């Protein structure tokens, strides 16, 4: 199954809430992108976050 | 043609003069009553109440049917002259509703009498019932004959 949505990020920790205004999404969760695979998927909405390795900024 | 146009006239008269028995069991009867009140005026369709089953064409099972009541509902249905139509109104009559797992409730009025239309809701709004009555009219137009 292909992801419903891909976002490219420059951080190894992302937050997802369904992108919906003022309580219309899902509970807000923080996800960790593994340094091995470089992507993580939201357990609520299945959105995939993919790391931009060259610009990935460690915090 | 003669016979199909004859049935069309019969279906037209039966749809335009659909008299329903004064028969309400529970809180679905409150919304059924609102359907005949000024906001909706069910009677403007020719759909008027009749106290006696001998003058009724339509039974609206509006409310919970208990085991103790089931013989009485069957009796007055049996005393409707034919054609007779039945509308099941609301969750209790449709399938038992909130009391489906009770010891004293019939789990759906179609265990007692045949049903033509099921109206969903608990209760269906007065407008939802009016929609259901017009769906019965479509059904009669689609399939009505001299028998029913």
């Amino acid at each position: 199954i292909p992801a419903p949505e891909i976002q490219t990020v420059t951080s190894w920790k992302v937050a997802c809430d369904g992108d919906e205004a003022r309580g219309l999404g899902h509970p807000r969760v923080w996800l960790a992108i593994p340094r091995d695979t470089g992507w993580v998927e939201c357990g609520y909405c299945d959105k995939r976050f993919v790391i931009d390795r060259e610009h990935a900024h460690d915090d | 043609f003669l016979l199909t146009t004859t049935e069309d006239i019969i279906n037209w008269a039966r749809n335009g003069s659909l008299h329903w028995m004064t028969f309400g069991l529970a809180c679905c009867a409150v919304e059924m009553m609102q359907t005949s009140m000024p906001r909706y005026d069910l009677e403007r369709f020719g759909t008027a109440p009749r106290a006696s089953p001998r003058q009724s064409d339509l039974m609206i099972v509006a409310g919970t049917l208990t085991n103790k009541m089931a013989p009485a509902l069957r009796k007055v249905y049996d005393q409707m002259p034919e054609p007779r139509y039945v509308i099941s109104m609301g969750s209790c009559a449709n399938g038992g509703g909130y009391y489906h797992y009770s010891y004293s409730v019939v789990r759906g009025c179609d265990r007692i009498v045949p049903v033509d239309i099921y109206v969903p809701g608990c209760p269906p709004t007065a407008e939802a019932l009016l929609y259901g009555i017009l769906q019965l009219q479509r059904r009669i137009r689609r399939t009505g004959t001299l028998v029913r």
Partner: protein
């Protein structure tokens, strides 16, 4: 027989007295893709639709449903509803037809889905 249909029936787009009333007091608000025409009186105090074909209340699409039921003030002509690309077109009530929904195990289906919850051993 067009006029007679209007004179004798009440399920074909409007009765004759509904048409007269609309002409006297109706103000056109817009149209939907089925050709149903929407009207108002008193600037939206009263709102009604003239059906193109059979007068079936389930033909009103979600585009106009909110306005027709006074949920929203403004018609979809002035304030159109936002639609997602995965949405599907409106369907009326299909109950008396062959397109009616039926459960997968229904005898109407003609291929009712067979159900089981264990795998049986098969002899060699």
């Amino acid at each position: 027989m067009s006029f007679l249909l209007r004179f004798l029936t009440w399920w074909n787009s409007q009765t004759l007295n509904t048409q007269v009333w609309t002409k006297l007091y109706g103000e056109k608000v817009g149209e939907d893709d089925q050709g149903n025409v929407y009207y108002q009186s008193g600037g939206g105090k009263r709102r009604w639709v003239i059906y193109n074909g059979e007068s079936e209340a389930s033909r009103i699409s979600p585009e106009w449903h909110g306005w027709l039921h006074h949920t929203y003030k403004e018609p979809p002509t002035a304030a159109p509803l936002a639609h997602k690309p995965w949405e599907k077109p409106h369907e009326p009530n299909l109950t008396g037809s062959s397109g009616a929904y039926h459960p997968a195990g229904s005898l109407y289906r003609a291929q009712p889905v067979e159900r089981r919850d264990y795998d049986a051993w098969q002899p060699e």
